[PDB]
RNA sequence: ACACCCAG
C-alpha cells in the first residue's frame, strides 16, 4: 500500500541491502573491464582498416570475431594448464588470457583464381584479466 | 589545432562553405530581433572583410599550418584536411559533414556571445558534471 | 536600431553619406547595392543597461520542477492563483536582486516583475 | 457547403522501378528565388576537383544571372524515408524514393580581392580604416 | 528641468576618415578616457 | 569540496599534505557509467517528432530546443513537455534506453 | 535544348506535391508488396475550423496513420529527377510538408525490441572458450 | 624515477 513513517527505517535499509547483494562494491572496476573485454576489444578489431598489399597479386586481410579463452599457464614442458589466481600470487605470474582472432585471407589475382582462405583462432597475444570479472576463472 | 597562431572565426566559417555574412550570422545569430549579439560580431565581420572566397579563405589557413605548403593547391589541401578529419571529429569526419560543423560553431560563438552579454553564467571549471572518470574499460581500450 | 541585409550579394549593409540630397543612406561595401533608409539610426548603446528582463525571460520555465511556487501572487491576465517566482541572478543587470513572477497556467506565459 | 464537409479519398501507389531517379533542390526562405525569372537553367559537375561523389554546380540564366552550388547532406537515409506525392489526372498517388538531398547556396558576383592581394592588404590590421575605399581600388 | 536630460553633440564643419566612424570612435574616448 | 559531490564523491576521506583535495573516493552508492552506443536513442528521435539538423532552415531554431546526443548537436524540437515525458517514461520502462 | 539543361515546365504549371516522412515499418511493408497496384489509402477530412489528414493501411498489406501538418515557411523545396537519357525535369514545387507517426502509443514498443533486436543481430561481441587453443 | 604515506 504505502510505507508508513515508522516502518520506512527498515524499507531504505533492505532497499540498500539489495543494492550491495546485486551490484556489490567494487562494481565500477568489474564493468569497465567487462565492457572492455565483451564489447571495446571487438570493436577495435572490426575498426581497424583491412590489410592490402601489392606487388601483380593482391591480398586482403579481413578479421573477424575475437576469442578470449580462460587464463592458462604454460610449463616448461609446453603443456597448457588453468592458472590459478593464488598461484599468480605465489609464481610471480601474471594473471593473463590468451587472445585469439579469426582471420580471412582473400588472394586477388588475375585469371579468375579468388581464393578464400580462413584462419581459426589465431594467437595474438595474452590480456591482462581482472580477477572476479566473467572473463576470470572465479 | 596544427595551426601555430590564431585565425578570425569568420574566416573559418567561410572555409567551411558558407560565404555570405546571411549565412553565418544565421548560424551564430538565431533571432535577429535583439541588436545586442548583432553588435558584438560586427568587429568579427570587419576583421574578415578582406577574404571574399572560399578558397582564398582555405588559402589563409593552410598559409598559418604547422607544415607550409609549396603551391597554392597544396596548402589548401592541408587546410581542407584539417578543416575536416581535425577539427571537431565528434560532430562528423566525412566530405560531405560540413553544414553540421557549422552550426556547431555556429553554437560555438553563440554560447561565447551569450556569456559576454552575462545572459547565462559561466561554466566553471571545478563542476563536477563537467568530468569524466577514466575507469579500467577505456583506460585499457586506449592502450589496445 | 537594426541593420537589413543585401538583396544582392547577402552581405551586411553599412551607413554611408550622399552629397546629392543629403539623406541617411545604407550602402553595401562588399558589392555596388544602394538602399536608401527611414529609420535615421546609425547606433544606439545602453550605457546604464536598462534592458527589459520581461522579454528575455522564457515563457517556459513555470514547469521546471526546481523552482519554488506560491498562490500569494495571482496572475493578472490569467487568473490563476499559483505561480512560478524566482531571481535573474545574471551580469549587466546592477543589483540583479527582485523577483520576477512567471505565471504556471498552461498556455499562459504573462510574465509580470512587480 | 460542400467545402466545409469535402470528402477526398485517393489512392496511393508505390511502383517497383522507375527509369528516372529523383533527387532534391532545397533553396533558403531568405534566398528570395523566383522561378518566373528562370528563362535558361544549366546544371553540371563542377571542375574544382580536377564524379559522382563530387558537390553540384546550377548555373542559372548563364552568366547574368545567379549561380548556385549543391552540397550533398551530411547524414544519410538509413533509418528514414521521404516520398513525394505527385497530383495525376488519374488521381492514384505516386510515392516515389529519394536518391539524395541536395543544399544550395546563392554565389555572390563581383570583382572579388585575389589571395595575392590579400595578404597585401593583411598588414593593416586594426588600422585599416575606410573599407569602402578598399573595394575602391579593386 | 525636462524630463530627458538632453544633451547634443556635433563636429566643427571643416571636416580620410569618414565621419560615420570618428564620431563613434570620439564617443567611446568621452566614456572611456574623459574626466568631468 | 565544490557543491556537487554530494552522494557520489565522499567529503570525509581525503589524504593528508601534498594531495589534499586531489584524491578523491567514491561514495557508497556511486555507480560510475560503463557507457553505451548512441544509435537506439538516435534512431528513436529520428523515428519522434524531432526535425533532422540539417533539414531545417536557420530561423526555426529561435522558437525551438536544440536536442544534444553526446555532446553533438542533432536536430531541434518543438515540443520539449512531451519529448522528457516520453523519455523519462521509456527509461523508468527500460525499453530502449 | 541542351544535356546539362534543366526542363522546368512543371514549375510553370504550379504543380503542387506534399513532402511526406514515414517510418521503417511502413516503407518495408510497401517494399514487401513488390507494388501490386495498392498498398495503403488515404483519408482526408475537414472540419469547420480544423483539418484531420491520416492514412489507413491496407487490410491485405498488414497480414490508422496520421499526417499531422508543419509549416511550410520554413523553406522553399522543389523537386526535380534525372533520367536514363540524362534529360533533367523538374516536376514542381512542395506545398505542404507532412510526417507520419504511429497509431500505437503503449503496445508499439514491442515492435520496436524486435528492430532493436534485429539491429543487434550482425553486431558481433568476443565469446569464450572454455578450453585453451592449441 | 614514480607512487603511497608519517609530522607540523
Ligand atoms: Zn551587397
Ligand atoms: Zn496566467
Known amino acids: ?31 569497465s573491464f567487462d565492457e572492455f573485454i565483451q564489447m571495446s576489444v571487438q570493436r577495435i578489431v572490426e575498426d581497424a582498416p583491412p590489410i592490402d598489399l601489392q606487388a601483380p597479386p593482391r591480398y586482403l586481410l579481413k578479421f573477424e570475431q575475437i576469442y578470449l579463452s580462460k587464463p592458462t599457464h604454460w ?45 581459426q583462432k589465431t594467437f595474438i597475444g595474452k590480456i591482462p584479466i581482472m580477477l572476479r570479472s566473467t572473463y576470470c576463472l572465479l | 589545432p596544427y595551426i601555430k597562431q590564431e585565425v578570425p572565426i569568420i574566416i ?36 574578415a572583410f578582406v577574404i571574399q572566397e572560399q578558397n582564398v579563405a582555405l588559402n589563409f589557413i593552410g598559409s598559418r599550418g604547422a607544415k607550409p605548403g609549396v603551391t597554392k593547391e597544396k596548402r589548401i589541401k592541408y587546410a581542407k584536411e584539417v578543416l575536416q578529419k581535425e577539427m571537431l571529429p565528434h560532430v562528423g569526419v566525412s ?17 561565447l556571445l551569450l556569456a559576454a552579454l552575462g545572459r547565462r553564467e559561466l561554466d566553471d571549471r571545478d563542476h563536477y558534471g563537467n568530468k569524466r572518470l577514466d575507469l579500467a574499460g577505456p583506460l585499457l581500450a586506449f592502450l589496445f | 536600431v537594426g541593420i537589413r541585409f543585401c538583396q544582392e550579394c547577402n552581405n551586411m549593409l553599412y551607413p554611408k553619406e550622399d552629397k546629392e540630397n543629403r539623406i541617411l543612406l545604407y550602402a553595401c561595401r562588399n558589392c555596388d547595392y544602394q ?33 519554488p511556487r506560491t498562490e500569494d501572487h495571482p496572475c493578472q491576465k490569467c487568473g490563476h492563483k499559483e505561480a512560478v517566482f524566482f531571481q535573474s541572478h545574471s551580469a549587466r543587470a546592477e543589483d540583479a536582486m527582485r523577483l520576477y513572477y512567471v505565471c504556471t497556467a498552461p498556455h499562459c506565459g504573462h510574465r509580470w516583475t512587480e | 457547403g460542400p467545402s466545409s464537409q469535402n470528402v477526398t479519398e485517393y489512392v496511393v501507389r508505390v511502383p517497383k522501378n522507375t527509369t528516372k531517379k529523383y533527387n532534391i533542390m532545397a533553396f533558403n526562405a531568405a534566398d528570395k528565388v523566383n522561378f518566373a525569372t528562370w528563362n535558361q537553367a544549366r546544371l553540371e559537375r563542377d571542375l574544382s576537383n580536377k564524379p559522382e561523389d563530387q558537390p553540384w554546380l546550377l548555373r542559372v540564366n548563364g552568366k547574368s544571372g545567379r549561380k548556385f552550388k549543391g552540397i550533398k547532406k551530411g547524414g544519410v537515409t ?43 592588404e593583411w598588414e593593416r590590421r586594426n588600422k585599416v580604416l575606410n573599407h569602402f575605399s578598399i573595394m575602391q581600388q579593386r | 528641468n525636462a524630463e530627458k536630460l538632453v544633451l547634443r553633440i556635433r563636429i566643427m564643419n571643416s571636416d580620410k576618415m569618414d565621419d560615420d566612424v570618428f564620431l563613434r570612435c570620439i564617443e567611446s574616448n568621452m566614456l572611456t578616457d574623459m574626466t568631468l | 569540496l565544490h557543491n556537487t559531490l554530494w552522494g557520489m564523491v565522499c567529503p570525509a576521506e581525503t589524504p593528508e599534505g601534498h594531495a589534499v583535495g586531489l584524491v578523491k573516493n567514491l561514495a557508497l552508492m556511486a555507480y560510475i557509467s560503463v557507457g553505451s552506443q548512441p544509435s537506439p536513442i538516435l534512431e528513436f528521435l529520428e523515428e519522434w517528432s524531432m526535425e533532422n539538423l540539417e533539414e531545417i532552415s536557420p530561423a526555426a531554431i529561435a522558437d525551438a530546443t536544440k536536442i544534444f546526443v553526446n555532446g553533438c548537436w542533432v536536430g531541434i524540437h518543438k515540443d520539449p513537455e512531451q519529448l522528457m515525458n516520453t523519455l523519462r517514461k521509456l527509461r523508468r520502462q527500460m525499453d530502449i534506453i | 535544348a541542351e544535356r546539362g539543361e534543366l526542363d522546368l515546365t512543371g514549375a510553370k504549371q504550379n504543380t503542387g506535391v506534399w513532402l511526406v516522412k514515414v517510418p521503417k515499418y511502413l516503407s518495408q511493408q510497401w517494399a514487401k508488396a513488390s507494388g501490386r497496384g495498392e ?63 504511429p497509431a500505437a502509443s503503449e503496445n508499439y514498443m514491442r515492435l520496436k525490441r524486435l528492430q532493436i533486436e534485429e539491429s543487434s543481430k550482425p553486431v558481433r561481441l568476443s565469446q569464450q572458450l572454455d578450453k585453451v587453443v592449441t
Not at chain 4, 513525394?84 to 547556396?105: K, L, R, S
Request: with cysteine.
Open chain 1, 1 to 31: 500500500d504505502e510505507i508508513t513513517p515508522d516502518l520506512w527505517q527498515e524499507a531504505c535499509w533492505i532497499v540498500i541491502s539489495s543494492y550491495f547483494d546485486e551490484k556489490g562494491l567494487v562494481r565500477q572496476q568489474l564493468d
Open chain 1, 75 to 119: 610449463e616448461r614442458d609446453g603443456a597448457p594448464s588453468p592458472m590459478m589466481p593464488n598461484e599468480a600470487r605465489l609464481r610471480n605470474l601474471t594473471y593473463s588470457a590468451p587472445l585469439y582472432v579469426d582471420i580471412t585471407k582473400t588472394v586477388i589475382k588475375e585469371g579468375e583464381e579468388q581464393l578464400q582462405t580462413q584462419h
Open chain 2, 12 to 47: 573559418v566559417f567561410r572555409a567551411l562553405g558558407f560565404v555570405s555574412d546571411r549565412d553565418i550570422l544565421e548560424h551564430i545569430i538565431y533571432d535577429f530581433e535583439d541588436p545586442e549579439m548583432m553588435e558584438m560580431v560586427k568587429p568579427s565581420l570587419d576583421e
Open chain 2, 95 to 111: 566530405d560531405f559533414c560540413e553544414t553540421k560543423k557549422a552550426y556547431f560553431l555556429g553554437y560555438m560563438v553563440h554560447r
Open chain 3, 35 to 67: 538602399q536608401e533608409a527611414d529609420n535615421s539610426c546609425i547606433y544606439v548603446n545602453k550605457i546604464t543597461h536598462e534592458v527589459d528582463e520581461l522579454t528575455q525571460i522564457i515563457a517556459d520555465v513555470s514547469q521546471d520542477p526546481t523552482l
Open chain 4, 78 to 120: 538509413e533509418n528514414t524515408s521521404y516520398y513525394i506525392f505527385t497530383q495525376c489526372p488519374d488521381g492514384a498517388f505516386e510515392a516515389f524514393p529519394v536518391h539524395n538531398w541536395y543544399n544550395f547556396t546563392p554565389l555572390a558576383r563581383h570583382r572579388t580581392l585575389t589571395a595575392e592581394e590579400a595578404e597585401e
Open chain 7, 39 to 101: 498498398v495503403g489509402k488515404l483519408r482526408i477530412a475537414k472540419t469547420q475550423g480544423r483539418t484531420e489528414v491520416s492514412f489507413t493501411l491496407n487490410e491485405d498489406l498488414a497480414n490508422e496513420h496520421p499526417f499531422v501538418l508543419q509549416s511550410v515557411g520554413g523553406q522553399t523545396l522543389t523537386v526535380f529527377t534525372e533520367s536514363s537519357s540524362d534529360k533533367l525535369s523538374l516536376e514542381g514545387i512542395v506545398v505542404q510538408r507532412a510526417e507520419c507517426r
